[PDB]
Amino acid sequence: HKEFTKFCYEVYNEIKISDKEFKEKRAALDTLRLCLKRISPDAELVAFGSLESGLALKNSDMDLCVLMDDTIALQFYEELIAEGFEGKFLQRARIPIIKLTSDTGFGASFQCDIGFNNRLAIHNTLLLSSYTKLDARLKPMVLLVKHWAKRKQINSPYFGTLSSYGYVLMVLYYLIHVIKPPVFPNLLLSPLKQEKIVDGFDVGFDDKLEDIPPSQNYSSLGSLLHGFFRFYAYKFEPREKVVTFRRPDGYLTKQEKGWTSDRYILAIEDPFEISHNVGRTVSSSGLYRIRGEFMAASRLLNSRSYPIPYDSLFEEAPI
Numbered sequence: 585h586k587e588f589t590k591f592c593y594e595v596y597n598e599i600k601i602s603d604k605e606f607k608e609k610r611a612a613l614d615t616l617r618l619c620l621k622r623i624s625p626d627a628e629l630v631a632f633g634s635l636e637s638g639l640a641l642k643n644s645d646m647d648l649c650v651l652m653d654d655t656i657a658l659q660f661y662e663e664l665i666a667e668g669f670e671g672k673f674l675q676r677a678r679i680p681i682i683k684l685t686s687d688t689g690f691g692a693s694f695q696c697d698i699g700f701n702n703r704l705a706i707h708n709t710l711l712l713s714s715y716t717k718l719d720a721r722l723k724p725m726v727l728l729v730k731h732w733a734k735r736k737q738i739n740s741p742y743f744g745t746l747s748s749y750g751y752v753l754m755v756l757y758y759l760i761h762v763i764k765p766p767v768f769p770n771l772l773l774s775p776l777k778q779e780k781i782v783d784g785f786d787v788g789f790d791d792k793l794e795d796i797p798p799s800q801n802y803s804s805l806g807s808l809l810h811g812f813f814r815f816y817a818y819k820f821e822p823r824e825k826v827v828t829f830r831r832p833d834g835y836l837t838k839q840e841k842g843w844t845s846d847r848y849i850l851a852i853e854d855p856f857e858i859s860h861n862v863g864r865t866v867s868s869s870g871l872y873r874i875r876g877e878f879m880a881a882s883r884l885l886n887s888r889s890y891p892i893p894y895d896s897l898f899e900e901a902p903i
Contacts (some may be wrong), residue, residue, distance in 0.1 A: 585677040589806030591894045599731045601640045612690045623663050627652040632705050637712040639726045646696040697829045734878045736901045744870030750862045753852050757827045758812050761834025765800040772829050787856045817878035826851040860897035
């Protein structure tokens, strides 16, 4: 996989966030933090998601969280509308959300999403951020899987398919517990790991990355991707197994977890919030499309017709 790896890195460099775009988002965050400072002096606005882990595709949306220690939620929204930003305040039960649309100069096409005390989400981002720092192969691979999923119309949680985070965990599971030699260790199950309970969940992992030995896996990005597709296309049985980060071998049956009868069509156990299935959005019809597109990828990469048209891997599939 020399030619495929060459193609992979070419695509990766086209789809990744530019340093220009990154600095624009970081500048926007500093402006919004100043807004929060004048209304709540002890609250902090922390960034999470793709932009924070570095697993962000160009023209990505911003995900922020206001952390504190009540009315501050709505009070922050009104100060933002006052400071020229355009958006709406939405609250379901006791969970408020700010959805920003524009700016009158980071705008006009400037999207941003602010949450309140979503601590677990910040921790999942810390875990992915650490893995990104461990191996250089993870960032391109994740972006390429994300770009493929998006283009093949299998990245719609609202339409019976999997979330982008779903695919990130699908990649991590493969690189930690499936590939041999593994590309990564399991930082959650490390003997150096210490328990840290946040919102009734253990968010602890070995973050002292400097002391972690280098990977014994020397495979290319192209080879890694060919394996990932082949695994989920032909070896992984979602009617039997759970994608997990809580077993040393990675072996967890749906029987053992009790996820046999939210939807359990595709079982992806969240690393910290273990009660939550990241693949709950995946429907029976949707899984069929996911399985179909995985087999298609495998078929393409084992083609005997040269030169192989690798471009078809990122060809937009009908809606």
